[PDB]
Design a protein around this ligand. Sequence first.
Ligand SMILES: CC(=O)N[C@@H]1[C@@H](O)[C@H](O[C@@H]2O[C@H](CO)[C@@H](O[C@@H]3O[C@H](CO)[C@@H](O[C@@H]4O[C@H](CO)[C@@H](O[C@@H]5O[C@H](CO)[C@@H](O[C@@H]6O[C@H](CO)[C@@H](O)[C@H](O)[C@H]6NC(C)=O)[C@H](O)[C@H]5NC(C)=O)[C@H](O)[C@H]4NC(C)=O)[C@H](O)[C@H]3NC(C)=O)[C@H](O)[C@H]2NC(C)=O)[C@@H](CO)O[C@H]1O
Ligand SMILES: *[C@@H]1O[C@H](CO[C@@H]2O[C@@H](C)[C@@H](O)[C@@H](O)[C@@H]2O)[C@@H](O[C@@H]2O[C@H](CO)[C@@H](O[C@@H]3O[C@H](CO)[C@@H](O)[C@H](O)[C@@H]3O)[C@H](O)[C@H]2NC(C)=O)[C@H](O[C@@H]2O[C@@H](C)[C@@H](O)[C@@H](O)[C@@H]2O)[C@H]1NC(C)=O
Ligand SMILES: *[C@@H]1O[C@H](CO)[C@@H](O[C@@H]2O[C@H](CO)[C@@H](O)[C@H](O)[C@H]2NC(C)=O)[C@H](O)[C@H]1NC(C)=O
Ligand SMILES: *[C@@H]1O[C@H](CO)[C@@H](O[C@@H]2O[C@H](CO)[C@@H](O)[C@H](O)[C@H]2NC(C)=O)[C@H](O)[C@H]1NC(C)=O
Length: 205
Amino acid sequence: GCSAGCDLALASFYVTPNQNVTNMADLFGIGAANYRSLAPYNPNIPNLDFINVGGRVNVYFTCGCRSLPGSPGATYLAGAFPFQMSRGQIYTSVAANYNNLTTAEWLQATNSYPANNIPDTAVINATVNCSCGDASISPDYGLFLTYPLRAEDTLASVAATYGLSSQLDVVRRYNPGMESATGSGIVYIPVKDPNGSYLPLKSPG
Ligand SMILES: CC(=O)N[C@@H]1[C@@H](O)[C@H](O[C@@H]2O[C@H](CO)[C@@H](O[C@@H]3O[C@H](CO)[C@@H](O[C@@H]4O[C@H](CO)[C@@H](O[C@@H]5O[C@H](CO)[C@@H](O[C@@H]6O[C@H](CO)[C@@H](O)[C@H](O)[C@H]6NC(C)=O)[C@H](O)[C@H]5NC(C)=O)[C@H](O)[C@H]4NC(C)=O)[C@H](O)[C@H]3NC(C)=O)[C@H](O)[C@H]2NC(C)=O)[C@@H](CO)O[C@H]1O
Ligand SMILES: *[C@@H]1O[C@H](CO[C@@H]2O[C@@H](C)[C@@H](O)[C@@H](O)[C@@H]2O)[C@@H](O[C@@H]2O[C@H](CO)[C@@H](O[C@@H]3O[C@H](CO)[C@@H](O)[C@H](O)[C@@H]3O)[C@H](O)[C@H]2NC(C)=O)[C@H](O[C@@H]2O[C@@H](C)[C@@H](O)[C@@H](O)[C@@H]2O)[C@H]1NC(C)=O
Ligand SMILES: *[C@@H]1O[C@H](CO)[C@@H](O[C@@H]2O[C@H](CO)[C@@H](O)[C@H](O)[C@H]2NC(C)=O)[C@H](O)[C@H]1NC(C)=O
Ligand SMILES: *[C@@H]1O[C@H](CO)[C@@H](O[C@@H]2O[C@H](CO)[C@@H](O)[C@H](O)[C@H]2NC(C)=O)[C@H](O)[C@H]1NC(C)=O
C-alpha cells in the first residue's frame, strides 16, 4: 500500500479530436481560468490553444494516499477530482472524459456509492492513479508521469521515449505487473520538473 503521498504528480493526457486545454484543466480541478498554469509543464506546447490530435498534454495534480472504500485494509495513491452530481450522471459518463487515465470500474471501486444509486446531490471523485516513488527503489526519482499505454506501447518503448533506457531495470520496479504489458494499462515514468530536476527523495529515518 502507501503511507503518505506527495504534492506533485503528472498525467499524460492523450489528445483526441476537438479536445482543448481548458477542458483538460477542468477535468483535473485546475479550473479553466487558470489553464495557463499548465504552460511550464508543457514546453513543447508554446500556444496552449493549439494541441495536435495524437499529441499529449501533461497535467499536474496532488497525489494523495487513500483507503479503498469497502475493501480490507487496501490503500492506493491517486489524485481525486470532485465532481458535483446532477440528475442523469453515471460512473461511466464521468469516466469517459478521462479516456484511459481511469475506468468506470475503478471509479465505482474508489467511491462510496453503488453505481445504481448515486444521489443526485452528491459529489463523487474522479480518481487518477499516480506514483510518488520509493526511496528503497531509488533516491533519485520523486516525480512521476501517469502514462496510459496505447497502440503498440510497452514500458520499454515509453521509458526509451523519456530517455530512461539505461535505467529500465529501475523503471520496471516502479511498475509491478506491467513489465509484460503491451498497448493497455497505466505505467509510471520518472520525469523532470519544470526546473530540470527529477526531485530526489529525502533519506528516511
Ligand atoms: C456492451 C459491452 O460489452 N460494452 C459496452 C457497454 O459498456 C456500453 O453500454 C453501457 O454500459 C454502462 C456500464 O455497464 C451502462 O451504465 C449503467 O447504466 C445504468 C442505467 O442507466 C446505470 O444505473 C443507473 O444509475 C443511476 C445513478 O445511480 C440511477 O439514478 C439514480 O436513481 C435513484 C433512484 O431512482 C435516484 O434517487 C432518488 O432521487 C429522488 C430525488 O431526490 C429522491 O426523492 C428519491 O428518494 C431517490 N430514491 C432513492 C431510492 O434513493 C437518484 O437521484 C438517481 N441518481 C442520479 C444521479 O440521477 C438509476 O436509477 C440507475 N438505473 C438503473 C436502471 O439501475 C448504472 O449506474 C450504469 N453503470 C455505471 C458503472 O455507470 C450503460 O447503461 C450502458 N449503455 C447502454 C446504452 O446500454 C455500450 C453502449 O455505450 O457500449 C459497449 O461497447
Ligand atoms: C472544450 O471542449 C469541451 C469538451 O468537448 C467534448 O470533449 C472533447 C474531448 C471532444 O470529444 C468534443 O467533441 C466534446 O464535445 C467543450 O464542451 C462541450 O461542449 C459540447 C457542445 O459543443 C457539449 O456537448 C453536448 O451538447 C449538446 C447540444 O445538443 C447537449 O444537448 C449535451 O447535453 C452536451 O452539452 C459537452 O457537454 C461539453 N463538454 C463539457 C465537458 O463541458 C467546450 O465547448 C465549449 O463549451 C461548451 C459548454 C459550449 O459552449 C460549446 O459550444 C463551446 O464551444 C470546448 N471549449 C471551447 C472553448 O471550444
Ligand atoms: C489504480 O491503482 C490500483 C492500485 O495499484 C489498482 O488496483 C489494483 O489492481 C490490481 C490488478 O492489476 C489488483 O491486483 C490489486 O488488488 C488492485 N489494488 C487495489 C487496492 O484495488 C487499480 O487497478 C488502478 N486503476 C487503474 C485505472 O489502473
Ligand atoms: C471523495 O474523496 C473525498 C476525500 O478527498 C471524500 O471526502 C470525505 O467526505 C466525507 C463526507 O461524509 C467526510 O466525512 C470525510 O471526512 C471526507 N474525507 C476526507 C476529507 O479526507 C469523499 O467521501 C469522496 N467521495 C465519495 C463519493 O466517495
